[PDB]
Design a protein around this ligand. Structure first.
Ligand code: HEM
Ligand SMILES: c1ccc2[nH]ccc2c1
Length: 464
């Protein structure tokens, strides 16, 4: 092999002395700024090829899609999944469960009228909850996550949760807690030194405890389902998997067994919850920071959908400004800045480099979402990045919040429908009020690591 150039590492600690665990994105970008957009870095004992900018990322993930379709490490989650489940797995296993998850979610109305209806109804219940706060100052966090979570929960568990179910709230905290840990300094230090840190006291233990509790929950729901299963009428994702497992009992090479079931279900429940929930939370903060933007959105809502009927996904075609604002919310939000790690599944010639089988690869989505060749004010919240001169919606090939290539988020259709329906349906009813003036609202992220987390804040939902 002939790996890209990079800073010389020390034994075991790797390039530790040249990385800021508190902001790995900037540290890697600082290093890019001197070795090129493609370089080698050593996270502790892990050798990783980093890709920065739309071009390097796009050349690998899309132009050589098959070769870069492997899955690399994500230490915190691997602690729990250990190669099982659809997301944090490789080869035939990732292939099967992905093929199956995709077909099953569609079977349950994802990307169709069915789920749009599910979302509309849940969007409904959220309005009730927010209106029931009667303009009181609140943390929107769990109001948003309970709503978001109910959509995917309807699909995997069969029905939604009551907004007051205490275990439900408990599960939401484990998710927010463990997801957030991966964004912190210790969470990133964990990506380098997990072989030593998993045995030491620290926030990593709390994160593990949380992951274990979510798995415990799922195994419980699986057992139940098993005893009341009707192999002729699947009620949810779990039944469909149980049925598939039934059919594959004879095959001793099948990927369809309980562990993959529990983990795949967790992947869907967790990602189906925390991602959209985090983007909505961030979005509101940005909207109250730019009242002028929330304004032009209301005007497009009232003018196209009206103050009467509930929004529908189809309305996005007549609302380029709202679509722009949402895209910009996602671009700015940069949820997974270093993306989710990939790895080459064979010896690969990439540019003037030769990456041996198994080499980890970080597709830095954050550097694509902020690429200066595609955005003029990469570091600012500006809805214009997605609107042309005439004021129409303008796509950008640098918009990759969902990644690209063969491992691209297959939950993308569902997320955009939820993002469009919750934002629009929420603002059709309310105007956002912050207890601080737009000038003092800090929209810089609270933590940036595996994920980008918004600062805590309270707000008021006042009727329009
Ligand atoms: C704001 C919303 C969301 C964003 C920004 C997001 C983005 C991402 C990203 C960047 C990846 C990694 C892709 C890669 O390996 O290159 C990922 C994968 C994945 N997402 Fe999402 N996601 C979101 C919502 C969803 C939803 C609603 C679901 C649930 C059905 C979901 C399910 C998954 C799964 C299962 C994977 C792993 C796929 C694989 O390994 O092949 N995501 N997502
Ligand atoms: C992002 C994508 C897929 C996932 N599965 C479990 C957590 C999670 C986060």
């Amino acid at each position: 092999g002939k790996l890209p150039p990079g800073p010389t590492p020390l034994p075991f600690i790797g390039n530790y002395l040249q990385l800021n665990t508190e902001q790995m994105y900037n540290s890697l970008m600082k290093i890019s700024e001197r070795y090129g957009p493609v370089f080698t870095i050593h996270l502790g004992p892990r050798r990783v090829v980093v890709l920065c900018g739309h071009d390097a990322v796009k050349e690998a993930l899309v132009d050589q899609a098959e070769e870069f379709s492997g899955r690399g490490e994500q230490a915190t989650f691997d602690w729990l999944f250990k190669g099982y489940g659809v997301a944090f797995s490789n080869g035939e296993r990732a292939k099967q469960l992905r093929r199956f998850s995709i077909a099953t979610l569609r079977g349950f109305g994802v990307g169709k009228r069915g789920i749009e209806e599910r979302i509309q109804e849940e969007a409904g219940f959220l309005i009730d909850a927010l209106r029931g706060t009667h303009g009181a100052n609140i943390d929107p966090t769990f109001f948003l996550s309970r709503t978001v979570s109910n959509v995917i929960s309807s699909i995997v568990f069969g029905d939604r949760f009551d907004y007051e179910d205490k275990e439900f709230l408990s599960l939401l905290r484990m998710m927010l807690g463990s997801f957030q840990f991966t964004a912190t300094s210790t969470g990133q230090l964990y990506e380098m030194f997990s072989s030593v840190m998993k045995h030491l006291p620290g926030p990593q233990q709390q994160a593990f405890k949380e992951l274990q509790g979510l798995e415990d929950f799922i195994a419980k729901k699986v057992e139940h389902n098993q005893r009341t299963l009707d192999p002729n009428s699947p009620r949810d994702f779990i039944d469909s998997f149980l049925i598939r497992m039934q059919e594959e009992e004879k095959n001793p090479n099948t990927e369809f067994y309980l562990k993959n079931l529990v983990m795949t279900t967790l992947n869907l429940f967790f990602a189906g919850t925390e991602t959209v929930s985090t983007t909505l939370r961030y979005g509101f903060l940005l909207l109250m920071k730019h009242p002028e933007v929330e304004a032009k959105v209301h005007e497009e809502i009232d003018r196209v959908i009206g103050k009467n009927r509930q929004p529908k996904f189809e309305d996005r075609a007549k609302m380029p400004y709202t679509e722009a604002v949402i895209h910009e919310i996602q671009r700015f939000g940069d949820m997974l800045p270093m993306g989710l790690a990939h790895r080459v599944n064979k010896d690969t010639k990439f540019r003037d480099f030769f990456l041996p089988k198994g080499t980890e690869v970080f597709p830095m989505l954050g550097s694509v979402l902020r690429d200066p060749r595609f955005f003029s004010n990469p570091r600012d919240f500006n809805p214009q990045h997605f609107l042309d001169k005439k004021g129409q919606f303008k796509k950008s090939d640098a918009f990759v919040p969902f990644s690209i290539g063969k491992r691209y988020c297959f939950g993308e259709g569902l997320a955009r429908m939820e993002l469009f329906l919750f934002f629009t349906t929420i603002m059709q009813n309310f105007r956002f009020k912050s207890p601080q003036s737009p000038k003092d609202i800090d929209v810089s992220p609270k933590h940036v690591g595996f994920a980008t987390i918004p600062r805590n804040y309270t707000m008021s939902f006042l009727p329009r």
